[PDB]
Paper text:
To prevent cell lysis, bacteria have mechanosensitive channels that are gated in response to the elevated membrane tension and release solutes, restoring the turgor within the cells. One of the medium-sized paralogues is called [name], with 5 TM helices. Structural studies have shown that the main difference between [name] and [name] are extended sensor paddles, which create a periplasmic indentation in [name], and much smaller portals in the vestibule that provide the cytoplasmic access to the pore. The TM paddles are in contact with the surrounding membrane and are therefore responsible for sensing the membrane tension, while the vestibule with the pore formed by the TM3 helices conveys conductivity and selectivity.
Closed [name] was purified for structure determination by electron cryo-microscopy in n-dodecyl-β-maltoside ([name]) supplemented with 0.5 mg/ml Azolectin (condition I+ ), resulting in a 2.2 Å map. The model built from residues 3–334 resembled the one of [name] purified in LMNG by Hu et al. with minor differences in the outermost TM helix (TM(−2)), which is frame shifted by 3 residues. In our model, Trp29 in TM(−2) is at the cytosolic interface of the membrane. We found that each sensor paddle has four TM helices that are interconnected by 1-2 hydrogen bonds to the adjacent paddle helix. For example, Asn8 in TM(−2) makes a hydrogen bond with Tyr63 in TM(−1). This hydrogen bonding network suggests that the whole paddle forms a rigid entity within the membrane. In the lipid supplemented [name], we could model eight C12 chains, representing alkyl chains, per subunit in the respective densities in the cytosolic pockets, yet we could not distinguish whether they were contributed by detergent or lipid. The eight alkyl chains formed parallel bundles with relative orientations that were compatible with four phospholipid molecules in a membrane context. Thus, the dispersed alkyl chain bundles were part of a hydrophobic inter-subunit interaction network that was located between the transmembrane part and the vestibule outside of the plane of the membrane. In the closed but not open conformation, the pore lining Met158 interacts with Met158 of one adjacent subunit and with Lys161 of the other adjacent subunit.
Author numbering:
A (entry chain B), B (entry chain A): 89 to 334
The structure:
C-alpha cells in the first residue's frame, strides 16, 4: 500500500510537471530516478521485517550513502551558505559589492537559496554560487563615506629648485577647495625619484560620494594643478633618454 | 536460478550491444566486468545464508565499497549537478553565456545529464562537465538590457586649455544622439594624467542590444568625436619622448 501511494504521488508530480510546460522525456527520466531512489530507500528500510540479510544490507547502504554524501557536497554547501546569508549577510539589495579574490563586481539584485543574482556595470546578469561568500573577502563600495582622489605630478629634473613652492601652492589650493573634505587625510609631498621625472604625490578625499560629482571635482582639481604647475615656470616631463651618436 | 537469470540478461545485453554496431572485444570486456561485479555483489549479499565468515566479509565489502566511493566521486558529481540544472538552471537553450573563472563562452545547445553542449563563436562544439556550474560564476550576456560604449580620448599636453570646451561639446553630442539611452549612465570627464597625453573618459549605453546596430552606432560616435576634437584646434597624441643628444 505504501509503494502504491508513493507511485501515485510520483505520477501526479510528473503529470503536473508536464502540465507546467516542460519536456516529456526529461520528465519521464526524472520520474524514473525518483522511483528508483524511493525503491532503494524502502529496501534499505524494510530489509529486515521482510528481508533476511543484515550485514550485507548494512554494508551496501553504508557505502552507497557514503558515495552520495561525498558527491553532493557542493550543492549542500551552497544551500547552507544561503541559510547563513539569510541570517547574516554583509550587504543588501541594491548594494554595489566587489571582492579582491574573485570577479563578482556589480549591484545585488536577488539573494536566493542557492545563488545570488548580481547586475554588472555592463548591464548583464551574473549568478554567483552562495558558497563563495563563506571563503572570500567581500568589499562594499555601496557603503563608502568618501571618494578618494590620488594622482602624481611628474616634473622635469631641471625643475628641482621649484618643488617646494609648487608643493606649497598645491597644498594651499587643496586646503581652500570647497569640494574637499578637510577632516580626512590630505597629503602633498615630493615622494620619489623616477626614471625621467621627480614625482609629487597627491592624496585627498571629497565630501560627496556620487559618481558624477566626484568626477567633476577631480577634473576641476586636475585643471587647477596644471595651471599651478605652469604658472611657476616648471613643466611636465615626457619619458627621456640620452643618446650617444656614432 | 538467480545467477542463471542474471547471466542470461547480461548475455542478451551484450548481443544487443553488438547488434547496435560496436566493437566485439570491447563488448566482451564490458560483459566480463558486469559479470564480475554481479558475482561480487551476490557474494557480499549471500555470504551468510550460504557462506560462513561474517567479520571478514564485512571488512572486505566495506573497504571495497569505500575505495569505489572515493574513486567515483566526479561522475556522481556531474550527475547530481545535472539534476540540479534540471530543476534550477540560470540559462536556457540558445542563450549566450560566459564565465570569469573558466573558458565556457558560447551559445547553449543542449543540457544533458552529464555534460552541457555549447556552440562557440568559432562554430565548434564544446562539452562542459555539469559539475562546473556548482562552483563558478556564470554570466548571461544573452539577457543584457543595453550595450556599453567606452573609450578614451588622449589629447596632447599643449591642448590643456581646450579640455573643458572639448568635454562640453562631446557631452552635448552624446546627449543629442538618437542611438544613446538617455536613462542610463552618461559620463564625459577629464580623467587622468598619462605618460604622453591627457585622457578623457567616455561612458554611455545604446538602446539596442543587437551586435551590428551597436557596432554601427559606435562607429558613428567615434567619427563624430574625431570631428569634434579636430574642429577645436586640438589633436590626438602619439607616444612622445624627449631626447638629449650627445
Ligand atoms: C505535488 C508536489 C510534489 C512534490 C514531490 C517531491 C518529491 C521529493 C522526492 C524526495 C526523494 C528522497
Ligand atoms: C539509457 C537509459 C538507461 C540508463 C541506465 C543507467 C544505469 C546506471 C547504473 C550504474 C550503476 C553503478
Ligand atoms: C533511465 C533512468 C536511469 C536512472 C539511473 C539511476 C542510477 C543511480 C546510480 C546511483 C549510484 C550510487
Ligand atoms: C519544485 C519541486 C522540487 C522537487 C525536488 C526533487 C529532488 C529529487 C532528488 C533526487 C535525488 C536522486
Ligand atoms: C529503463 C532503465 C533500465 C536500466 C535501469 C538501471 C538501474 C540501476 C540501479 C542501480 C542502483 C544502485
Ligand atoms: C543534495 C541537497 C539538496 C538540497 C536542496 C534544497 C532546496 C531548498 C529550496 C528552498 C526554496 C525553493
Ligand atoms: C547550517 C548553517 C546554519 C547557519 C546559522 C547561522 C546563524 C547566525 C546567527 C546570527 C545572529 C545575528
Ligand atoms: C536490455 C537492457 C539491458 C540493460 C542492462 C543494465 C545493466 C546494469 C548493471 C548494473 C550493475 C550494478
Ligand atoms: C588481460 C585481461 C585480464 C585483466 C585482469 C585484470 C585484473 C585486475 C585485478 C586487480 C585487483 C586489485
Ligand atoms: C578481462 C576483464 C577484467 C575486469 C577486471 C575488473 C577488476 C575490478 C577491480 C576493482 C577493485 C576494487
Ligand atoms: C545504455 C545502457 C547503460 C548501461 C550502464 C551499465 C553500467 C555498468 C557499471 C559497472 C561498474 C563496475
Ligand atoms: C580473463 C580475465 C582473468 C583475470 C580476472 C581477474 C579478476 C579479479 C577480480 C578482483 C575482484 C576484487
Ligand atoms: C557511478 C555513478 C554512475 C551514475 C550514472 C547515471 C546515468 C544516468 C543517465 C540518465 C539518462 C540516460
Ligand atoms: C541530489 C541533488 C538534488 C538537487 C535538488 C535541487 C532542488 C531545487 C529546487 C528549486 C525549486 C525552484
Amino acid at each position: 500500500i505504501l509503494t502504491i501511494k508513493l507511485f501515485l504521488l510520483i505520477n501526479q508530480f510528473e503529470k503536473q510537471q508536464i502540465k507546467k510546460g516542460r519536456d516529456i522525456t526529461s520528465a519521464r527520466i526524472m520520474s524514473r530516478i525518483i522511483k528508483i531512489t524511493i525503491i532503494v530507500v524502502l529496501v534499505l528500510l524494510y530489509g529486515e521485517h521482510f528481508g533476511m540479510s543484515l550485514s550485507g544490507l548494512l554494508t551496501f547502504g553504508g557505502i552507497g550513502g557514503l558515495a552520495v554524501g561525498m558527491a553532493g557536497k557542493d550543492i549542500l554547501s551552497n544551500f547552507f551558505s544561503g541559510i547563513m546569508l539569510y541570517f547574516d549577510r554583509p550587504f543588501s539589495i541594491g548594494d554595489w559589492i566587489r571582492s579582491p579574490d574573485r570577479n563578482i563586481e556589480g549591484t545585488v539584485a536577488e539573494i536566493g537559496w542557492r545563488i545570488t543574482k548580481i547586475t554588472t556595470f555592463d548591464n548583464r546578469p551574473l549568478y554567483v554560487p552562495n558558497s563563495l561568500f563563506s571563503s572570500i573577502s567581500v568589499e562594499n563600495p555601496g557603503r563608502m563615506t568618501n571618494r578618494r582622489i590620488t594622482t602624481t605630478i611628474g616634473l622635469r629634473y631641471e625643475d628641482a629648485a621649484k618643488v617646494g613652492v609648487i608643493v606649497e601652492a598645491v597644498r594651499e589650493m587643496l586646503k581652500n577647495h570647497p569640494a574637499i573634505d578637510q577632516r580626512q587625510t590630505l597629503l602633498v609631498y615630493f615622494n620619489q625619484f623616477a626614471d625621467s621625472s621627480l614625482n609629487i604625490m597627491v592624496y585627498c578625499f571629497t565630501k560627496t560620494t556620487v559618481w558624477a560629482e566626484w568626477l567633476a571635482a577631480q577634473q576641476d582639481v586636475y585643471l587647477k594643478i596644471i595651471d599651478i604647475v605652469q604658472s611657476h615656470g616648471a613643466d611636465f616631463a615626457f619619458p627621456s633618454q640620452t643618446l650617444y651618436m656614432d
